[PDB]
Amino acid sequence: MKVSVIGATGYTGYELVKILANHPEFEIAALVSETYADKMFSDVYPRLRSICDVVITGRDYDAVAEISDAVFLCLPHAAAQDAAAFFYEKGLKVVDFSADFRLKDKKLYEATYKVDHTYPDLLRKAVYGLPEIFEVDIKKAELVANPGCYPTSVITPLYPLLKAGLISPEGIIADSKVGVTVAGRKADIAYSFCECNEDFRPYAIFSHRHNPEINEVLKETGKETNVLFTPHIIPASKGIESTIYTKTTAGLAEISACLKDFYRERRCVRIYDNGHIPSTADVTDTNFIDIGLFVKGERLIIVSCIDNLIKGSSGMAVQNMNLMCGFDDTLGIL
Amino acid sequence: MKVSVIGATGYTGYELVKILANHPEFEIAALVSETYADKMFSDVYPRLRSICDVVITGRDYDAVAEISDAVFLCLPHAAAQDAAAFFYEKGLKVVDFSADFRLKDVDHTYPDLLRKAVYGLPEIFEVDIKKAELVANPGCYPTSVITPLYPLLKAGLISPEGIIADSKVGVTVAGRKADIAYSFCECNEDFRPYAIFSHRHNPEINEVLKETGKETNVLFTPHIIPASKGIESTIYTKTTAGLAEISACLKDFYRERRCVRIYDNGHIPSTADVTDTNFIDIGLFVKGERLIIVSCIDNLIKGSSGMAVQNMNLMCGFDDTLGIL
Ligand code: NA
Ligand code: NA
Ligand code: NA
């Protein structure tokens, strides 16, 4: 099966190509980048020399659609909508890395971006690609909205606890931290080495687009949540750690059993209830999500770690494409 | 004036010696590091070659008392108690870096001395520090949390309940220790929480905040940054007041304290803004009934050695920012 990557020279595209080169079913057709067209992919990433030397092509979406059965969209806001619309109408399967199709409520989209959605009819066909929760919907999908990296680390541990009513839906605080790769492959001074090295900073206080995504997805548990989310930048390349504060009516063993029962068949989910504390190094360069549970009285603290570029992006995207194409979601990953 | 440093070769003593070398009134008499005795301080830290070449001496506390008017104790627990008792009985001013004398409330060896100890947060308890002989230096984490919270609780502009402090520190928090958990290869590119529900600084924060008359139950969770220095504390509180009144309460309380830099305009402090300085940067953000405070310090300076020089300045009748600003 032929797949193409639009915006292939970014960091999410690099991590995607690494997985795709070893995937037993997906064959790389085209890698699209206007900046690096006509260059080999290994010219941009010499680490992949002799592993993936595919010549990068420009944004000729017509030629891409003729040689591809499915497409990964590693494109920024708005540009992702245009590409998703084009390749969807050509009959291809589409995984969109952007946030543009994650909020199915148009009024919530407009509340977040202050503008209308450009393809509202296409929006109603998008499925939220959190593979360990919405697998049934994803298998029936043609357009998948790849979840955000932060929401992946927060929704995954919270969803089964709220569904079973073991924690309060009110007052949840998610204090999350990410490596600099969250910005993507950018030349801006804000993401230069000398500005980011040795620096740790919060950002997007009261205003990050992932906050509405988190609360809108947790609605599906039947509980209305008002999760407060605050992101931070780590002076490291990759990794997310989310320290999540909740109120609980259950103890450590009951909370642990709820999470381990819900994800019993999911080999990418590693849950700890023995005092082990996950860190970003435990999940960097893997597709795992590590969840640590800690209970004192009526307070539950969850530590949730992922590689933002893999389980938070490209690895989760391969899981979604696997599900849409009838394969096991972990095929080519584990 | 003559001052000495006990346990001077740690990172806190390193930052302390940097300040003392350029201090107009404090004159270094002895730098005590027992594992490094008979080496020059610049042998351990070559950056200070030609700046502080003082020969490190051993554990001769009688000799230190002979030549010193005051002493900084950068010692671990228990050892800090004995040294603090010795130099107090000899009539010296003492700033203890450890936690042995912070909490006025496994029994304390010197309980009568504990009652004389003053909690050395210079911008809050300056009145009591000017009259003290023994000052307990606050911890680095509590300094970043207590400073923005104390005026708001005292004015009743935030709720004392449900406060959450999610704090992050560079690896220098561990000190100059031989330990695999603090090696470069184990800490590089890694970010981790630790001491969940169990860090010793959590009780310190709540005990000091009681002085406002409000009973707090701050929940504090620390994290290790893959960087050398800096603390960032994201503090979550509930409030019914506006940003203007929260901002005005903090700026009025710290009006003449030049090391406190308070922002209310959307500026977000970061650890790079305060690293290698004695400043504490505080950013204020209000949406509805939620106040988010961003508090940053250098954990080795404003969180430790710089704050200690403020406390020693105050005890010695000097301006608290002397030798710092
Ligand atoms: Na680093
Ligand atoms: Na782990
Ligand atoms: Na900054």
Author numbering:
A (entry chain A): 1 to 334
B (entry chain B): 1 to 105, 115 to 334
Paper passage:
Here, we seek to establish the direct reduction of formyl phosphate into formaldehyde through developing a new-to-nature enzyme, formyl phosphate reductase (FPR). We identify promiscuous FPR activity in four enzyme families and present one homolog of N-acetyl-γ-glutamyl phosphate (NAGP) reductase from Denitrovibrio acetiphilus (DaArgC) that produces relevant levels of formaldehyde. The ArgC active site can be divided into three parts, the NADPH-binding domain, the catalytic site, and a substrate-binding channel. The catalytic site consists of catalytically active C149 and the HRH motif (residues 208-210) responsible for binding the phosphate and carbonyl group of the substrate (gray labeling in Fig. 3a).
Round 1 of mutagenesis resulted in variant DaArgC G182V (DaArgC1), which was followed by an S178V substitution in round 2 of mutagenesis (DaArgC2). Using double variant DaArgC2 as a template, we discovered a L233I substitution that showed an additional beneficial effect, resulting in triple variant DaArgC3. Using a semi-rational enzyme engineering approach, we create a triple substitution variant of the enzyme (DaArgC3) that shows a complete loss of the native enzyme activity (i.e., NAGP reduction), a 300-fold shift in specificity towards formyl phosphate, and a decreased side reactivity with acetyl phosphate. Across all substrate concentrations, DaArgC3 showed a fourfold improved formaldehyde productivity over wild-type (WT) DaArgC in vivo. Variants DaArgC1, DaArgC2 and DaArgC3 showed similar turnover numbers (0.1–0.2 s−1), but were already saturated at apparent Km (formyl phosphate) values around 20-30 mM, indicating that they performed better at formyl phosphate concentrations that are physiologically more relevant in vivo. The apparent Km for NADH (~0.3 mM) was approximately sixfold higher compared to NADPH, while the specific activities were at about 50% of the activity with NADPH (~0.1 s−1), indicating that variants DaArgC1-C3 had evolved to also accept NADH as redox cofactor, which they could additionally access in vivo besides NADPH. When we re-established the glycine residue at position 182 in DaArgC2 and DaArgC3 (creating variants DaArgC2* and DaArgC3*), NADPH selectivity of the variants was fully restored, indicating that the glycine to valine substitution was responsible for the observed cofactor flexibility. Solving the crystal structure of DaArgC3 suggested that the position of residues T9, S33, E34 and T35 (numbering according to mtArgC29) that interact with the 2′ phosphate of NADPH was not significantly affected by the G182V mutation. However, we noted that G182 lies within the conserved GAG motif of the substrate-binding channel (residues 182–184) and is flanked by two amino acids, T181 and R185, that form hydrogen bonds to the nicotinamide group and the diphosphate of NADPH, respectively.
